[PDB]
Write a protein that binds this DNA or RNA. Structure first.
Length: 224
RNA sequence: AUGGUUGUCGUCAGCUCGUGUCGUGAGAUGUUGGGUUAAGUCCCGCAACGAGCGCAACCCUUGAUCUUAGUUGCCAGCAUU
């Protein structure tokens, strides 16, 4: 149930270069972009609300996938205060597709985290805690958010239809569900729940990650 | 026919694999791009993530001292040739 007047601050994206696939829902082109179709964004937002809620209540983690600059606040704050464990940094190569070696990276994050209070310092010299503290300092800042997915990512809320293209291929690898807000200059048939709206406005990112993350959040704690 | 052993290419810095992806395939990707180093050394981007031998360091010697300890070694500080 998208805020229809509140949706009037997140309709707009690239234009003059829009493919034929993700342009069927286009309203019209008035001199700067194609105006995205509003009512399609509303009804699709309802499909993400009901399907994201009811499918999110089956118990599986939601992958708050985000790439772009200023797309990490909506996914880190949205999922990090939501219930999913996503990755808003530069994308790891083959995130779900590796599924074990990313786990062993979770092992280096595990001994790096638990080695902080594990007497990791004060055993070896200053090069040990210095180089190793650089190791978790340059490991946790890249691949820490996967700790909220010990099983496979049951769904991929990807927030970047172009920058996250290797992610869309990764979820294309398994039969996993990958719904996401893909821009006007994107490919339509690659995703299963199209959020046909822009992503340029950061307030559009807060409305997208807030509707998604709040959808899975409010739909999930209602068991008691 | 060989085991064992040893030269050089050369202390030059390379040489590979597990997993994943691409490509019908052989293959590739990592190992390429950006700098920086003696170094595939280090860092950062990167469809890759990791590890193995290599590099390095660890070993010995070399110039600085401390502490232990002074005999055949050293002789300041005294007599002695």
């Amino acid at each position: 149930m998208k805020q229809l007047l509140e949706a009037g601050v997140h309709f707009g994206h690239q234009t003059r270069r829009w493919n034929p696939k993700m342009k069927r829902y286009i309203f019209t082109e008035r001199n700067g972009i194609y105006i995205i179709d509003l009512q399609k964004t509303v009804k699709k937002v309802e499909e993400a609300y009901n399907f994201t809620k009811n499918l999110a209540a089956e118990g599986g983690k939601i992958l708050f996938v985000g790439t772009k600059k200023q797309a990490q606040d909506s996914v880190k704050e949205e999922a990090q205060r939501s219930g999913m464990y996503y990755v808003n940094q530069r994308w790891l190569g083959g995130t779900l597709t590796n599924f074990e070696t990313i786990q062993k990276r979770i092992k280096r994050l595990k001994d790096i985290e638990k080695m902080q209070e594990n007497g990791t310092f004060d055993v070896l010299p200053k090069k040990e805690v210095v180089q190793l503290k650089k190791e978790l300092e340059r490991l946790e800042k890249f691949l820490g958010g996967i700790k909220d997915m010990k099983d496979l990512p049951d769904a991929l809320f990807i927030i970047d239809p172009r920058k996250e293209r290797i992610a869309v291929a990764e979820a294309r690898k398994l039969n996993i569900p990958i719904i996401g807000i893909v821009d006007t200059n994107c490919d339509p048939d690659e995703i299963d729940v199209v959020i046909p709206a822009n992503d340029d406005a950061i307030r559009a990112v807060k409305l997208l990650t807030s509707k998604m993350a709040d959808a899975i959040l409010e739909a999930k704690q209602g068991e008691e």
